[PDB]
Design a protein around this ligand. Sequence first.
Ligand SMILES: [Mn+2]
Ligand SMILES: [Mn+2]
Ligand SMILES: [Mn+2]
Ligand SMILES: [Mn+2]
Ligand SMILES: [Mn+2]
Ligand SMILES: [Mn+2]
Ligand SMILES: [Mn+2]
Ligand SMILES: [Mn+2]
Ligand SMILES: [Mn+2]
Ligand SMILES: [Mn+2]
Ligand SMILES: [Mn+2]
Ligand SMILES: [Mn+2]
Lengths: 185, 185, 185, 185, 185, 185
Amino acid sequence: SARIGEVKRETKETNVSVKINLDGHGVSDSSTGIPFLDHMLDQLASHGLFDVHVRATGDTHIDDHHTNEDVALAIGTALLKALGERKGINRFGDFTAPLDEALIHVSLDLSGRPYLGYNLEIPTQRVGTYDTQLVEHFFQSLVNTSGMTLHIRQLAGKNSHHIIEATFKAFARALRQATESDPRR
Amino acid sequence: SARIGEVKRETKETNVSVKINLDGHGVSDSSTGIPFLDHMLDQLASHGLFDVHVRATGDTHIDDHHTNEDVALAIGTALLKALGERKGINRFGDFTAPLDEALIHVSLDLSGRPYLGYNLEIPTQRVGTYDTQLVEHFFQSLVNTSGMTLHIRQLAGKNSHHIIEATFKAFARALRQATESDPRR
Amino acid sequence: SARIGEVKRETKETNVSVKINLDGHGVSDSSTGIPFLDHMLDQLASHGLFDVHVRATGDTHIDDHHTNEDVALAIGTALLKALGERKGINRFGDFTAPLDEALIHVSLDLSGRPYLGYNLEIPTQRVGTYDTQLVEHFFQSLVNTSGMTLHIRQLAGKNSHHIIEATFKAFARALRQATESDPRR
Amino acid sequence: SARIGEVKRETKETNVSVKINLDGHGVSDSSTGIPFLDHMLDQLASHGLFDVHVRATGDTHIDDHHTNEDVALAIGTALLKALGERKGINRFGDFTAPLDEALIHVSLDLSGRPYLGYNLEIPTQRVGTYDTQLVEHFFQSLVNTSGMTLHIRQLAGKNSHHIIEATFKAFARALRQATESDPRR
Amino acid sequence: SARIGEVKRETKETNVSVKINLDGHGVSDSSTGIPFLDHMLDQLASHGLFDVHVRATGDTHIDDHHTNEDVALAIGTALLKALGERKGINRFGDFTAPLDEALIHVSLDLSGRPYLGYNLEIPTQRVGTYDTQLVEHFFQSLVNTSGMTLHIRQLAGKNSHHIIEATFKAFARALRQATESDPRR
Amino acid sequence: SARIGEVKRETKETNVSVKINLDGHGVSDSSTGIPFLDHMLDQLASHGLFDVHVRATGDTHIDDHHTNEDVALAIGTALLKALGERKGINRFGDFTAPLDEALIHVSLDLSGRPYLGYNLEIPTQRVGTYDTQLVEHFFQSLVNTSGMTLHIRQLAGKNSHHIIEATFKAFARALRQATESDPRR
Ligand SMILES: [Mn+2]
Ligand SMILES: [Mn+2]
Ligand SMILES: [Mn+2]
Ligand SMILES: [Mn+2]
Ligand SMILES: [Mn+2]
Ligand SMILES: [Mn+2]
Ligand SMILES: [Mn+2]
Ligand SMILES: [Mn+2]
Ligand SMILES: [Mn+2]
Ligand SMILES: [Mn+2]
Ligand SMILES: [Mn+2]
Ligand SMILES: [Mn+2]
């Protein structure tokens, strides 16, 4: 039985639906109203082999902040649900991924205590129409509802798209590791 | 046949018995007369899936130094014994583990040449009654008798218990990797 | 069917033949006219479990530069050939290896876009008769023909032989990882 | 009907029971196995007019860390339970309290998003037998389970007992404010 | 006839008895009420080949200061007594001793003029329950009653126990040299 | 009965035979395939009054590293063998030797715990054909198999040959001291 977590959450600002399969095949099905975030969620699915279904609508006329936050909160909860009792898994993940000149190390533990360590220095304010301050907020919010210990470390990088995308690749691979079965447990 | 190493060593200062199973299930059975060290040895077993049996008595009225040292020396020898001819193993291990805000990278090679690289900066002098200078000495002594190449790198951390415990988690996971069978060897 | 790439390339300066098996057993069979480079190619085979066959002759009376370059170019092409359509592989590799006091992190992606990030600081000009500037050039040239994204990071080290050899160990292990089958792909 | 939250939580390390009345009279009834922490919990009751009942036992032979953490986690959950639907309350609290030369500002929001901002610089390692690193950990853990936004700012202070005690006074008064009824809501 | 010095000294704070044989076999028989100091006195006997008998009781409820001081004063006097007319001895001693990473140089002259040069930098405040400020005070007090010129120089060291113990080894060996017969005198 | 240690060790890289007499007359009989190292081994014999017999062959086409290392490892083991139970010896050695402007202090203890402290700054890369990085590696490897505590301190020096040769003189004299009988033991 595949480990699936589903969350529906409505606020005055946003409406969000998430479904995640930890034991997926990389099926990507994300539409948040934020194209860059959709692109990063595709990366999460492809590089983590999660199946990721996300729908969101919200007050993007104001800015992308509330939608970005509420998407991330719901993903964190969906991951927590899917994990269930967490028996027999690796629990820890550790991966360093490049994207051309960018190089990002991610280390995480599915600990039940939220913590984000984050040192990205993204040198431009907008990637497309996406506010690059929202990258940290995405991870922070995801940590807070999932109860994950997460460290994100920028080792190299110049291009903002490369830096952010490499982060999602490394995160996805580390989370795949952590969620997979430990053969000796 | 599980790989088991046993060491009994007596000095004027200490009496030590160690038994380690490299192919264990995380059985933790350590009583050194140093409660913090017992706690760290439990971590080694749990995170490495080693079975760890340690008994020690010694001159803890003077300080914990001699007991800590002689425990570590005997563990190093027990690991060397258990490894035997070292045929078919990964040999190398590499893991970065968090504990909340702390993040520790451990890289090791079961090389037969002792070396410790160590850069922890533990910001308090005592964790409980345990002298935090003894952490480096534990690893140094273990390296010296095991003939291990070991690098311990503090990437982040503020709380002394977190820093030390994360170190043992990362070490345990790296040593598990190094001791496991390489499927292509 | 094992994945084998073969390259023969002649220039006015050099004559080079390379055969690499990605699914090898560590068979080492390298003779380049540069003894230190032969030694490093042996490391690549042993630590990566590649079978590596290299023959080169060239204008070593001038210096080792042209031979080193043309060997590396041909290895890069051989790796590209052997990889074929790249279906079902890990693609990414990440390994940190020590050699005594030296510690080198290698992260790579078989991306099809060449990039070398390289920060080694080798403190002597010659290891034997081998010009230590040629280490960077070897990796650069290999990247350029293979289309690999490669980051090489010196974390520690003092002895030039240790630094360079640790680099080849880490590279070999990372490349083994990247080239191996992903069990979920 | 007074707002009461009760939590019982057992781990391998600790056993904890907490009962908190938000609409109390300052009844103090705390015994954690950590005398300094008991003293601070008395301050919370007296200065906040909470009724605070805490019992804990744990592995204080190792150090006070696990007990301190698990007490704080359970208090955070008890506060969350007691708050219920959070209708009609002030929600925000803001108080700056002195204790002789020490002066501590606390600002909080019962937001449902955990965050701790903390800048105390406690100039000694032990107050009695209490490790002063545990002050931050107490607040962090409490924030994490309560979902509180909490900022703690040291404006002045030299004596470690004064600094920590002033913090608890300011926190208690700010939390009393936040939990009280807003007369216009 | 072996050179033996005996001192009994009582104060309101302490009661001390010392017997030292300059021409001993390393017989160690010290009980001061300060375990670390007992350990160092054992080192003095073992490394100097002095026979050392010490008994002390005192006001260790206040701290170890008075006992440490009065032990050292009495040892200095005992050494002076034992030396007698100082005819035919080397008089000068010079030894540099390691203990792992620690390296301590001691040079002394049995001159009849007290002087202590001391540059140890002991990086922790307590070794066991022993206040590391008391090391300097021990040597100072010993110098003052013995009338010794003594220089203690820290050349290397990180571990406080190693630094202090190496000091006693070097001191013992230098004092053995100084007290021994000069074959040409 | 003179104390003689003999070691034969073969690797894929090197073949080494060592015989050392601790109670020798300075008989020098070393041929390693590294002329500078032979010269230093002659110094060890002459200045230490050891009889030193060394034969080595190896992969000097690559560089002198493996031969230098394997010679030193075997010397360390030979010294350990020769020492036997270590009863009645001085154990410690301490000597500062000049060679013209160069001045090197060596302090050692035949402790059974390996440690090298080394601060030489050799201002040229090659003495003859000998890579001056290999000096540290020689001492490190010797320490590792002998279980010696060794500190090497450069007090003065400009000429690389003088610095290295003075080091071997001081080491030889210190080791002679440590290995000799203590007349009171
Ligand atoms: Mn927000
Ligand atoms: Mn993209
Ligand atoms: Mn020690
Ligand atoms: Mn713990
Ligand atoms: Mn070129
Ligand atoms: Mn080599
Ligand atoms: Mn904790
Ligand atoms: Mn108080
Ligand atoms: Mn005094
Ligand atoms: Mn000791
Ligand atoms: Mn080497
Ligand atoms: Mn010479």
